Amino acid sequence: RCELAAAMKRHGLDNYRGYSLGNWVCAAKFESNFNTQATNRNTDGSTDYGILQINSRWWCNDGRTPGSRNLCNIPCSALLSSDITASVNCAKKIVSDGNGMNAWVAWRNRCKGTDVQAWIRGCRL
Amino acid sequence: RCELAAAMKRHGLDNYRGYSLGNWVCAAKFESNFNTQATNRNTDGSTDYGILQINSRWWCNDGRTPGSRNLCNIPCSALLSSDITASVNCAKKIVSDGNGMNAWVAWRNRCKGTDVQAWIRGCRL
Amino acid sequence: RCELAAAMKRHGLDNYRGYSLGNWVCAAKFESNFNTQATNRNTDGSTDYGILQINSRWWCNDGRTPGSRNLCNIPCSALLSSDITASVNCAKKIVSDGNGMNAWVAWRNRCKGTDVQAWIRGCRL
Amino acid sequence: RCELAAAMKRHGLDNYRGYSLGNWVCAAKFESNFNTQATNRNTDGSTDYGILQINSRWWCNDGRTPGSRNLCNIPCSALLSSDITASVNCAKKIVSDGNGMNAWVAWRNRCKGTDVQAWIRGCRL
Amino acid sequence: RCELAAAMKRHGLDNYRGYSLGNWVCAAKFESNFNTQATNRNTDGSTDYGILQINSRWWCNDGRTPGSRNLCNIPCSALLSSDITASVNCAKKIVSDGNGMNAWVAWRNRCKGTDVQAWIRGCRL
Amino acid sequence: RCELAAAMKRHGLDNYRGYSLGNWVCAAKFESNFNTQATNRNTDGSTDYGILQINSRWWCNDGRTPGSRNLCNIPCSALLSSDITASVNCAKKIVSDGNGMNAWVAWRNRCKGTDVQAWIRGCRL
C-alpha cells in the first residue's frame, strides 16, 4: 500500500482605503513617495492638508545685471527628481569619454516567489 | 503500508487606511518618503497639516550685479531628489574619462521568497 | 507501517491607519523618512501640524555686487536629498578619471525568506 | 411799509434694515414685541438664531386617570397673548352682571402733531 | 417800517439696523419686549443666539391619578402675556357683579407734539 | 423801524444697531424687557448667548395621586407676564362685587412736547 497527497490554499491581501504591496521577492530599484492616506471629517470649519507647502513670493529668480559677461545661472534644477545622469550642466566646453559612469548595468537573477516540493523515492509495491 | 502528505495555508495582510508592504525578500535600492497617514476630526475650527512647510518671502534668488564677469550661480539645486550622478555642474570646462564613477552595477541574485520540502527516500513496500 | 506529514499556516500583518513592512530578508539600501502617523481631534480651536516648518523671510539669496569678477555661488544645494555622486559642483575646470568613485557595485546574494524541510531516509517496509 | 413771511421745511426718517416709528403724539395702547433686527455673516459654520426656543419633549399634557369624576384641566392657556377679558374659564356655573369689568372705555382726545402760528395785529399803513 | 418772519427746519431720525421711536408725546400703555438687535460674524464655528431658551424634557404636565374626584388643574397659564382680566379661572361656581374691576377707563387728553408762536401786537405804520 | 424774527432747526437721533427712543414727554405705563444688543465675532469656536436659560428636565409637573379628592393644582402660572387682574384663580366658589379693584382709570393730561413763543406788544411806528 502506497498513499500520498499535496495541498495548498492561497488568498491575497485585503486593502481598505490604503496602499499595499504584498510580497515582492527579488526587486531592484524601488521608489515610492507621497502615497498618502487620510481621513478627514470636517464640521463647521476649514481643513488644509498638504505634505509640501512652499509659500515663496520671490523664489529662485535672478536680479537685474546690465552689461554682464559670461554668466552661468541654474536655479531650482533637479527638484523632486530621480536618475539625472550627467545632466543639466551649466558649462561652455564638455568632453566625456571612457568605459565609466555606468548606471544599473549587467545583473543576473534567479528568483522564485514560492516553492513547494514532495519527494517520494521508492515504495516498490 | 506507506502513507504521506503535505499541506500549506497562506493569507495576505489586512490594511485599513494604511501603508503596508508585507515581506520583500532580496530587495536592492528602496526609497520611501512622505507616505503619510492621518485621521482628522475637526469641529468648529481650522486644522492645517503638512510635513514640509517653507514660508520664505525671498528664497534663493540673486541680487543686482551690473557690469559683472564670469559668474557661476546655482541656487536650490538637487532639492528633494535621488540619484543625481555627475549632474547639474556649474563650470566652464568639463573633462570626464575612465572606468570609474559606476552606480549599482553587476549584481548576482539567487533568492527564494518561501521554500517547503518533503523528502522520502525508501519505504520499499 | 510508515506514516508522515508536513503542515504550515501563514497570515500577513494587520495594519490600522499605520505604516508597516513585515519581514524583509536580505535588503540593501533602504531609505524611509517623513512617513508620519497622526490622529487629530480638534473642537473649537486651530491645530497646525508639520515636521519641517521653516519661516525664513530672507533665506539663501545673494546681495548686490556691481562690477564683480569670477564668482562662485551655490546656495541651498542638495537639500533633503539622497545619492548626489560628484554632482552640482561650482568650478571652472573639471578633470575626472580612473577606476574609482564607485557606488553600490558588484554584489552577490543568496537569500531565502523562509525554509521548511522534512528529511526521511529509510523506512524500508 | 409792512413786510412779513412764514417758512417750514420737513423731511421724514431714514431707515436702513431697521424698525422705526418717528413721532406719535397722543397714542393709547401700543404693543410691540419680537420686532427683531439681525445681521449674520456665516462662513464655514452653523448659526442658529431665535428669541424663544422651547425644547420640551413632554410639555403641558395630562396623564392617565381611569374612572375619574368632575375634572377641570386647562394647560398652556393665554400663551403669548393680549386682551383676554373674562375668557377661557374652567368652571361648571358662570353668572356675570353689572356695570363693571370695563376695558378702555369713554376717552376724550384733543391732539395736534405740530402747530405753527404767525400773529400780526396792526401795521395800519 | 415793520418787517417780520418765522422759520422752522425739521428732519427725522437716522436708523441703521436698529429699533428706534423718536418722540412720543402723551402716550398711555406702551409695551415692548424682545425687540432684539444683533450682529454675528461666524467663521469656522457654531453660534447659538436666544433670549429665552427652556430645555425641559418634562415641563408642566400632570401625572396618573386613577379614581380621582373634583380636580382643578391649570398648568402654564398666562405665559408671556398681557391684559388677562378676570380670565382663565379654575372653579365650579363664578358670580361677578358691580361697578368695579375697570381697566383703562375714562381718560382726557390735551396734547401737542410741537408748538411755535410769533406774537406781534401793534406796529401801527 | 420795527424788525423781528423766529428760527428753529431740529434733527432726530442717529441709531446704529441699537435700541433708542428719544424724548417721550408725558408717558404712562411703559414696559420694555429683553430688547438686547449684541455683537459676536466667533472664529474657530462655539458661542451660546441667552438671557434666560432654564435647563429643567422635570419642571413644574404633578405626581401620581390615585384615589384623590378636591385637588387644586396651578403650576407655572403668570410666567413672564404683565397685567393679570383677578385672573387664573384655583377655587370652587367665586363672588366679586363693588366699586373696587380698578386699574389705570380716569386720568387727565395736558402735555406739550416742545413750546416756542415770541411776544411783541407795541412798537407803534
Side-chain angles (χ1 to χ4, degrees):
Chain A
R1 281 183 178 232
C2 195
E3 295 75 9
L4 59 96
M8 186 164 186
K9 212 182 83 177
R10 294 158 42 76
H11 174 36
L13 66 84
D14 314 318
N15 182 11
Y16 300 90
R17 287 176 207 128
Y19 187 92
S20 57
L21 323 172
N23 305 293
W24 283 26
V25 180
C26 203
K29 184 177 153 82
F30 180 94
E31 185 283 327
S32 66
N33 310 115
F34 307 102
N35 317 78
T36 63
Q37 331 172 128
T39 173
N40 182 230
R41 289 176 185 145
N42 175 68
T43 72
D44 307 299
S46 65
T47 72
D48 183 275
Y49 172 102
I51 307 302
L52 270 47
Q53 63 183 310
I54 295 87
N55 280 24
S56 279
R57 60 178 190 183
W58 284 275
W59 198 352
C60 59
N61 69 74
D62 312 316
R64 294 179 177 138
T65 184
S68 291
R69 183 172 178 126
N70 192 253
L71 292 85
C72 172
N73 300 292
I74 168 159
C76 294
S77 167
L79 192 134
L80 279 159
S81 55
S82 294
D83 287 5
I84 315 293
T85 302
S87 283
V88 196
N89 311 80
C90 184
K92 296 295 158 181
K93 302 182 190 289
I94 297 162
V95 177
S96 59
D97 200 6
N99 187 18
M101 201 189 274
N102 304 283
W104 294 99
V105 183
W107 286 49
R108 299 159 188 176
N109 303 115
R110 265 264 178 179
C111 282
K112 276 68 62 171
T114 303
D115 292 319
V116 177
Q117 293 173 7
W119 289 30
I120 303 92
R121 193 182 298 275
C123 66
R124 308 180 189 177
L125 205 77
Chain B
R1 281 183 178 232
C2 195
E3 295 75 9
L4 59 96
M8 186 164 186
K9 212 182 83 177
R10 294 158 42 76
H11 174 36
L13 66 84
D14 314 318
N15 182 11
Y16 300 90
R17 287 176 207 128
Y19 187 92
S20 57
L21 323 172
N23 305 293
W24 283 26
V25 180
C26 203
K29 184 177 153 82
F30 180 94
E31 185 283 327
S32 66
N33 310 115
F34 307 102
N35 317 78
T36 63
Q37 331 172 128
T39 173
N40 182 230
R41 289 176 185 145
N42 175 68
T43 72
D44 307 299
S46 65
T47 72
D48 183 275
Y49 172 102
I51 307 302
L52 270 47
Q53 63 183 310
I54 295 87
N55 280 24
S56 279
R57 60 178 190 183
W58 284 275
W59 198 352
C60 59
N61 69 74
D62 312 316
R64 294 179 177 138
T65 184
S68 291
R69 183 172 178 126
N70 192 253
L71 292 85
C72 172
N73 300 292
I74 168 159
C76 294
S77 167
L79 192 134
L80 279 159
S81 55
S82 294
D83 287 5
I84 315 293
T85 302
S87 283
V88 196
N89 311 80
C90 184
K92 296 295 158 181
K93 302 182 190 289
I94 297 162
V95 177
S96 59
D97 200 6
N99 187 18
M101 201 189 274
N102 304 283
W104 294 99
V105 183
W107 286 49
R108 299 159 188 176
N109 303 115
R110 265 264 178 179
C111 282
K112 276 68 62 171
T114 303
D115 292 319
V116 177
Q117 293 173 7
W119 289 30
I120 303 92
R121 193 182 298 275
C123 66
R124 308 180 189 177
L125 205 77
Chain C
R1 281 183 178 232
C2 195
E3 295 75 9
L4 59 96
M8 186 164 186
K9 212 182 83 177
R10 294 158 42 76
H11 174 36
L13 66 84
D14 314 318
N15 182 11
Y16 300 90
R17 287 176 207 128
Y19 187 92
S20 57
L21 323 172
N23 305 293
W24 283 26
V25 180
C26 203
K29 184 177 153 82
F30 180 94
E31 185 283 327
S32 66
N33 310 115
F34 307 102
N35 317 78
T36 63
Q37 331 172 128
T39 173
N40 182 230
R41 289 176 185 145
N42 175 68
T43 72
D44 307 299
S46 65
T47 72
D48 183 275
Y49 172 102
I51 307 302
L52 270 47
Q53 63 183 310
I54 295 87
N55 280 24
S56 279
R57 60 178 190 183
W58 284 275
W59 198 352
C60 59
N61 69 74
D62 312 316
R64 294 179 177 138
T65 184
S68 291
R69 183 172 178 126
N70 192 253
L71 292 85
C72 172
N73 300 292
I74 168 159
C76 294
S77 167
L79 192 134
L80 279 159
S81 55
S82 294
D83 287 5
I84 315 293
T85 302
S87 283
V88 196
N89 311 80
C90 184
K92 296 295 158 181
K93 302 182 190 289
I94 297 162
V95 177
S96 59
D97 200 6
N99 187 18
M101 201 189 274
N102 304 283
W104 294 99
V105 183
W107 286 49
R108 299 159 188 176
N109 303 115
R110 265 264 178 179
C111 282
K112 276 68 62 171
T114 303
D115 292 319
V116 177
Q117 293 173 7
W119 289 30
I120 303 92
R121 193 182 298 275
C123 66
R124 308 180 189 177
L125 205 77
Chain D
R1 281 183 178 232
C2 195
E3 295 76 9
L4 59 96
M8 186 164 186
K9 212 182 83 177
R10 294 158 42 76
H11 174 36
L13 66 84
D14 314 318
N15 182 11
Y16 300 90
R17 287 176 207 128
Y19 187 92
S20 57
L21 323 172
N23 305 293
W24 283 26
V25 180
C26 203
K29 184 177 153 82
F30 180 94
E31 185 283 327
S32 66
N33 310 115
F34 307 102
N35 317 78
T36 63
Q37 331 172 128
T39 173
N40 182 230
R41 290 176 185 145
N42 175 68
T43 72
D44 307 299
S46 65
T47 72
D48 183 275
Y49 172 102
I51 307 302
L52 270 47
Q53 63 183 310
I54 295 87
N55 280 24
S56 279
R57 60 178 190 183
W58 284 275
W59 198 352
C60 59
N61 69 74
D62 312 316
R64 294 179 177 138
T65 184
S68 291
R69 183 172 178 126
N70 192 253
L71 292 86
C72 172
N73 300 292
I74 168 159
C76 294
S77 167
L79 192 134
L80 279 159
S81 55
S82 294
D83 287 5
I84 315 293
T85 302
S87 283
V88 196
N89 311 80
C90 184
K92 296 295 158 181
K93 302 182 190 289
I94 297 162
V95 177
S96 59
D97 200 6
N99 187 18
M101 201 189 274
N102 304 283
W104 294 99
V105 183
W107 286 49
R108 299 159 188 176
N109 303 115
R110 265 263 178 179
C111 282
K112 276 68 62 171
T114 303
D115 292 319
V116 177
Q117 293 173 7
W119 289 30
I120 303 92
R121 193 182 298 275
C123 66
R124 308 180 189 177
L125 205 77
Chain E
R1 281 183 178 232
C2 195
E3 295 75 9
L4 59 96
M8 186 164 186
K9 212 182 83 177
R10 294 158 42 76
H11 174 36
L13 66 84
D14 314 318
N15 182 11
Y16 300 90
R17 287 176 207 128
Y19 187 92
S20 57
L21 323 172
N23 305 293
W24 283 26
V25 180
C26 203
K29 184 177 153 82
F30 180 94
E31 185 283 327
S32 66
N33 310 115
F34 307 102
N35 317 78
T36 63
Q37 331 172 128
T39 173
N40 182 230
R41 289 176 185 145
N42 175 68
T43 72
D44 307 299
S46 65
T47 72
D48 183 275
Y49 172 102
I51 307 302
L52 270 47
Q53 63 183 310
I54 295 87
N55 280 24
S56 279
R57 60 178 190 183
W58 284 275
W59 198 352
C60 59
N61 69 74
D62 312 316
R64 294 179 177 138
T65 184
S68 291
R69 183 172 178 126
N70 192 253
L71 292 85
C72 172
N73 300 292
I74 168 159
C76 294
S77 167
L79 192 134
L80 279 159
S81 55
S82 294
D83 287 5
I84 315 293
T85 302
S87 283
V88 196
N89 311 80
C90 184
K92 296 295 158 181
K93 302 182 190 289
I94 297 162
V95 177
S96 59
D97 200 6
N99 187 18
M101 201 189 274
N102 304 283
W104 294 99
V105 183
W107 286 49
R108 299 159 188 176
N109 303 115
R110 265 264 178 179
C111 282
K112 276 68 62 171
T114 303
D115 292 319
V116 177
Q117 293 173 7
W119 289 30
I120 303 92
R121 193 182 298 275
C123 66
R124 308 180 189 177
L125 205 77
Chain F
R1 281 183 178 232
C2 195
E3 295 75 9
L4 59 96
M8 186 164 186
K9 212 182 83 177
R10 294 158 42 76
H11 174 36
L13 66 84
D14 314 318
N15 182 11
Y16 300 90
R17 287 176 207 128
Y19 187 92
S20 57
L21 323 172
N23 305 293
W24 283 26
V25 180
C26 203
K29 184 177 153 82
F30 180 94
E31 185 283 327
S32 66
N33 310 115
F34 307 102
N35 317 78
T36 63
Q37 331 172 128
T39 173
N40 182 230
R41 289 176 185 145
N42 175 68
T43 72
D44 307 299
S46 65
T47 72
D48 183 275
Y49 172 102
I51 307 302
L52 270 47
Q53 63 183 310
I54 295 87
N55 280 24
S56 279
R57 60 178 190 183
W58 284 275
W59 198 352
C60 59
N61 69 74
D62 312 316
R64 294 179 177 138
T65 184
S68 291
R69 183 172 178 126
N70 192 253
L71 292 85
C72 172
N73 300 292
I74 168 159
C76 294
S77 167
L79 192 134
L80 279 159
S81 55
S82 294
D83 287 5
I84 315 293
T85 302
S87 283
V88 196
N89 311 80
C90 184
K92 296 295 158 181
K93 302 182 190 289
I94 297 162
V95 177
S96 59
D97 200 6
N99 187 18
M101 201 189 274
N102 304 283
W104 294 99
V105 183
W107 286 49
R108 299 159 188 176
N109 303 115
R110 265 264 178 179
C111 282
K112 276 68 62 171
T114 303
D115 292 319
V116 177
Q117 293 173 7
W119 289 30
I120 303 92
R121 193 182 298 275
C123 66
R124 308 180 189 177
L125 205 77

